[PDB]
Amino acid sequence: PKGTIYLTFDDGPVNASVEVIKVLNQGGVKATFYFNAWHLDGIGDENEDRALEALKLALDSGHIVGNHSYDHMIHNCVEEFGPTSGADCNATGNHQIHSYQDPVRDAASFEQNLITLEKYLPTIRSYPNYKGYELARLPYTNGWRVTKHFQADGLCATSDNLKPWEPGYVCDPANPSNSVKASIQVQNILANQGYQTHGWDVDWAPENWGIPMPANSLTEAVPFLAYVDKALNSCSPTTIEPINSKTQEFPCGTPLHADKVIVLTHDFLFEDGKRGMGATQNLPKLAEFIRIAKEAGYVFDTMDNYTPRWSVGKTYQAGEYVLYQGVVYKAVISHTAQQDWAPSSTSSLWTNADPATNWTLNVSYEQGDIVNYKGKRYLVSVPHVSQQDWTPDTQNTLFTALE
Amino acid sequence: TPKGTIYLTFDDGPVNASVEVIKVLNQGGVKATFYFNAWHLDGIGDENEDRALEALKLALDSGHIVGNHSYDHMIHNCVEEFGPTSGADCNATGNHQIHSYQDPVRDAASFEQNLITLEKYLPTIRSYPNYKGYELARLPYTNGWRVTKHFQADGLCATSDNLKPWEPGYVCDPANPSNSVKASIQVQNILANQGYQTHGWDVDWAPENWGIPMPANSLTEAVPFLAYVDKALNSCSPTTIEPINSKTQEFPCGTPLHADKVIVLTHDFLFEDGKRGMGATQNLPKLAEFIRIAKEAGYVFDTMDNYTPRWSVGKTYQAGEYVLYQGVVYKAVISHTAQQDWAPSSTSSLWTNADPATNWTLNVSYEQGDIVNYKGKRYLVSVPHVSQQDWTPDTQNTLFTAL
Numbered sequence A: 001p002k003g004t005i006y007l008t009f010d011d012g013p014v015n016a017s018v019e020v021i022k023v024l025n026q027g028g029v030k031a032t033f034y035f036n037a038w039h040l041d042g043i044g045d046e047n048e049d050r051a052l053e054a055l056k057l058a059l060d061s062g063h064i065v066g067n068h069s070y071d072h073m074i075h076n077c078v079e080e081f082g083p084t085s086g087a088d089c090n091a092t093g094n095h096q097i098h099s100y101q102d103p104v105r106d107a108a109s110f111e112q113n114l115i116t117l118e119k120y121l122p123t124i125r126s127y128p129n130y131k132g133y134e135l136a137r138l139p140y141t142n143g144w145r146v147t148k149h150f151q152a153d154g155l156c157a158t159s160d161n162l163k164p165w166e167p168g169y170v171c172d173p174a175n176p177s178n179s180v181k182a183s184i185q186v187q188n189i190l191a192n193q194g195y196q197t198h199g200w201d202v203d204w205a206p207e208n209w210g211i212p213m214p215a216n217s218l219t220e221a222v223p224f225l226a227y228v229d230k231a232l233n234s235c236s237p238t239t240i241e242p243i244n245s246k247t248q249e250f251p252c253g254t255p256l257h258a259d260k261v262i263v264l265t266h267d268f269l270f271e272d273g274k275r276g277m278g279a280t281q282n283l284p285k286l287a288e289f290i291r292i293a294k295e296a297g298y299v300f301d302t303m304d305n306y307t308p309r310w311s312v313g314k315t316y317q318a319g320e321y322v323l324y325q326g327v328v329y330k331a332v333i334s335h336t337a338q339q340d341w342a343p344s345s346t347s348s349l350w351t352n353a354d355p356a357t358n359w360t361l362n363v364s365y366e367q368g369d370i371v372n373y374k375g376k377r378y379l380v381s382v383p384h385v386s387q388q389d390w391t392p393d394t395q396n397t398l399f400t401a402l403e
Numbered sequence B: 001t002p003k004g005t006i007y008l009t010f011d012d013g014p015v016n017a018s019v020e021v022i023k024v025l026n027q028g029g030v031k032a033t034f035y036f037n038a039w040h041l042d043g044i045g046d047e048n049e050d051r052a053l054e055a056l057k058l059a060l061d062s063g064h065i066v067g068n069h070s071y072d073h074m075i076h077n078c079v080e081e082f083g084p085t086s087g088a089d090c091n092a093t094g095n096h097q098i099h100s101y102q103d104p105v106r107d108a109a110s111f112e113q114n115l116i117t118l119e120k121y122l123p124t125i126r127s128y129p130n131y132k133g134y135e136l137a138r139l140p141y142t143n144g145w146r147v148t149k150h151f152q153a154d155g156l157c158a159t160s161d162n163l164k165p166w167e168p169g170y171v172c173d174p175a176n177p178s179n180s181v182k183a184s185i186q187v188q189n190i191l192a193n194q195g196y197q198t199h200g201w202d203v204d205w206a207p208e209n210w211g212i213p214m215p216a217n218s219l220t221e222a223v224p225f226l227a228y229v230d231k232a233l234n235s236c237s238p239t240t241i242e243p244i245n246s247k248t249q250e251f252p253c254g255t256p257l258h259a260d261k262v263i264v265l266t267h268d269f270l271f272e273d274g275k276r277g278m279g280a281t282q283n284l285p286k287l288a289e290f291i292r293i294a295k296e297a298g299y300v301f302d303t304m305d306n307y308t309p310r311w312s313v314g315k316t317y318q319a320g321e322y323v324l325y326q327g328v329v330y331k332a333v334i335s336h337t338a339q340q341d342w343a344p345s346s347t348s349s350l351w352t353n354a355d356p357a358t359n360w361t362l363n364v365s366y367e368q369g370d371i372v373n374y375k376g377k378r379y380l381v382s383v384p385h386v387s388q389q390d391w392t393p394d395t396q397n398t399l400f401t402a403l
């Protein structure tokens, strides 16, 4: 394959999701849906009476479900959150303003999302493709928590002052908005709960938002495939437009990102409704894109595999990353994986490389890392692999407590 | 070798009384397990609880294990509508044990809300290895157990649909339990599928007389309570315990994991000078003395994270022995000595997953008649076997029979 494409759909489950899923199924591909469960409560200001049906269909069809937060941070778009808050924020269009405030409350939205999903579909944890507690993506934000050495934020994703299209819009990555700072904290809080978060390389969106029925201008399949070709191995998270979609410090050439393109789009762009005739005009674009992308040599995969699963029989080079039972690991020495030699907290063959900050066992800590342990912060003074006896509060030759 | 292992477990914190309890534990040189209800942090649990957050921090900093007792102790099922006054309202009626469990999905959800609230008031809590809020739980009112695949049992008269156990005409039929009890059984199962273990108790350190105006005063004295512990050692107390609503009728008497162990249940608020009596003045000395004389008698104290012994390299295990590893229960396949690189996992040849859960899972030894959930459907295990990736219930209609 010349590459791997990860189709990722945000903001479902809504009525529009149903036909999208069927197009994916007809195309013989799996995708990842980052869901907001407020649609299940009927307060997300979309056609969403089939929300539960859509959730069931995505899961029964084998697509991966991940976590986009319960309400898409709309509680930060309004004064008091309630059943009309989606409509109100849609009225004002202030989604990108003050999007993140209290990072603790905002992170908690991701856990509430789990509660609501498991309320409406009590059997959801019986699905191996339910990944709501492992894979997340922040609203508005092209941010990444993939490995210890693959993390980067969307430094101008959201704003404190005014929406980005306007004269005088200021974006300083070195001194980001309050909303962006808070969102960075949200990322860290999720990573410490074991989440990975992923941004995107290309955004399948209206070419022109100013025309009537803007959804109709979704990029046609042929030129969209052109965008994907251009993104392939080109660190497009740094070059993408608009500015609020950029990942300024994305680690270009990082090994896990090679030969891969993550596509972001939205289920709601594919319905005939308030944004245009998205079903009529866009379902065929999705279908054709899948076909021509395969013709060109691409294969489609899902985000649970973006970090490849540890696999018995495969030989690994030192430095390579795998995902095993939800945890990221990096090979310590080159070897061939065998049944009893899986990654773990005690394996000599692997170290834990989750994108987290809480002190953890079997991590290869580097000079300058800061970890949290029993409510305090510690600076790593000497590189080493962590172990049970070497806790930060008892190893002053390895850690120094910060103020 | 020690006479046995005692597990001190305190329920219904964190409250003011918890602080001095913790200090006594520390002076006694022991660790305990606190099953907390986080509503006290919100100041609506109708206790003296302005120091709730102080008590939580102290418990964790002191190395005690924090487990999950649900957010509101199911008080939402004691009143028509849950709110800031419900704790008080339920204490007025004394109907805690009636209709205690109703909608098991909502009730289970209270355990996850508990995590949100704990991680709200103490945002650093996940940096404590002794925070086990997402791994260890205990149901309100209920001597019920989800420990391993072959160590689970319910409190079949723990809660009632009408009368309380002491009221005339009250009937307990374990063979046809109350609707409240049936709901609680489903709650146990939901939690198990989220990776929780739940544990009941062997002895309950409580008023010897609830009919006086200061019942806390009659808490069993240290010496006779130690006599209760001796009595409970290896004698299947959960079956013989009184009152009837504290029984675990089908507890697996003699099960190896319970050998030479006694779990003590008590409550932080029994050690308070307050509405229940002079608990701090009279009972803190009882606790302190108990610890001292128990140790003198040859007992050692441990916590519930070790009740199922943690896997440790260099230790020898026998076929059928259980360990806990990274929060997951495993059962040894053959006699062997644990090595660094050979840890229990989903692919190990030396171990099988033996979590007390019902969702289909890799590397589990399934018995005939087991019922597993998979992608929203239920399946009877028709052919006992050890599960593997290629033998999913939806593709294996000889091993499994759809229900």
Ligand SMILES: CC(=O)N[C@@H]1[C@@H](O)[C@H](O)[C@@H](CO)O[C@@H]1O
Pocket (backbone or CB within 6 Å): A011, A044, A072, A086, A090, A095, A275
């Ligand atoms: C112009 C447009 O389609 N905006 C939508 C908004 O309506 C929606 O509530 C939000 C969360 O789903 O996503 C986007 O910001």
Ligand SMILES: CC(=O)N[C@@H]1[C@@H](O)[C@H](O)[C@@H](CO)O[C@@H]1O
Pocket (backbone or CB within 6 Å): B012, B045, B046, B073, B087, B091, B096, B276
């Ligand atoms: C008699 C007594 O102390 N009952 C308490 C009740 O007051 C409390 O609200 C509940 C939850 O903490 O636990 C017990 O049922």
Ligand code: NA
Pocket (backbone or CB within 6 Å): A134, A194, A195, A196, A326, A327, A328
């Ligand atoms: Na993870």
Ligand code: NA
Pocket (backbone or CB within 6 Å): B135, B195, B196, B197, B327, B328, B329
């Ligand atoms: Na567990």
